């Protein structure tokens, strides 16, 4: 299962996705995805709510409501940072999952969760939400039920 | 000031070593200054942290975006024959910069005969 996820973290592009209900360590196993993805050859970037702990090497960026920054507009504001890799906290709604999906098409490898009870679930929500049902063949590299 | 030499002398230093862009980053303890010189990216020089907001309002005022506020994303512009793209973001440890620079037929675009 590591040598599979190390694979598939180390990907020049695409989706990963954690799924799972509430208290399921999801971040805990994403923060050791880019932990172990935490090189200088890569420029990784992330936007939380909250921040859970700092990677040191890593930027992470808070979802602010005082400023109006949200995760669609904090995911936005990273993609012009020129990043290597992205992780985004959850994608809650479609315009978040939007930007997602065209950032793991223009050559980033995106992360993120989505509260789902199984792997297929991940595919599911992305398709509920208003995802054209294409667009998730083609970005989405895997999901990880936990 | 020395700071506005500083950030001008490094656009040429960018611009030498044939970099796309300058990955200006504040971390807890250190400030680290980085190109991406042809896709690949480059450690080039960590200076002291307590810089970290001098270097952030001299590149913000040179693209005319507001000093003060460092709790939104600001993109501006400026132009040097290189023209860059500013784009700061905040976060744990202040804001990040980052500057995209960018040197200044119909059917060659894409467009076809008919």
């Given at each position: 299962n590591h040598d599979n996820f190390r694979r598939l973290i180390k990907r020049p592009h695409g989706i990963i996705l954690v799924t799972g209900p509430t208290g399921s360590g999801k971040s805990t196993t994403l923060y050791a995805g880019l932990q172990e993805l935490n090189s200088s050859e890569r420029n990784i970037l992330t936007v939380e709510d909250p921040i859970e702990f700092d990677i040191d090497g890593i930027g992470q960026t808070q979802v602010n409501p005082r400023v109006d920054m949200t995760f669609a507009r904090g995911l936005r504001a990273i993609?012009?940072?020129?990043?290597?890799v992205v992780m985004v906290g959850?994608?809650?709604?479609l315009e978040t999952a939007q930007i997602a999906v065209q950032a793991s098409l223009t050559g980033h490898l995106v992360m993120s969760t989505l509260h789902t009870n199984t792997a297929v679930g991940a595919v599911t929500r992305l398709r509920d939400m208003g995802i054209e049902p294409f667009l998730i063949s083609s970005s989405l590299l895997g999901v990880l039920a936990q | 000031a020395p700071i506005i030499k500083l950030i001008n002398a490094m656009l040429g230093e960018a611009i030498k070593e044939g970099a796309s862009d300058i990955h200006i980053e504040t971390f807890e303890k250190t400030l680290s200054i980085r190109f991406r010189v042809d896709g690949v990216l480059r450690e080039v020089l960590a200076p002291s942290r307590k810089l970290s907001s001098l270097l952030v309002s001299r590149v913000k005022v040179m693209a005319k975006l507001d000093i003060a506020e460092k709790r939104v994303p600001q993109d501006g512009r400026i132009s040097l024959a290189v023209d860059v793209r500013v784009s700061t973001m905040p976060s744990s440890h202040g804001e990040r910069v980052v500057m995209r620079l960018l040197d200044k037929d119909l059917h060659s675009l894409g467009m076809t005969a008919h």
């Open positions: 993609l012009r940072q020129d990043p290597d959850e994608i809650r709604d | -």
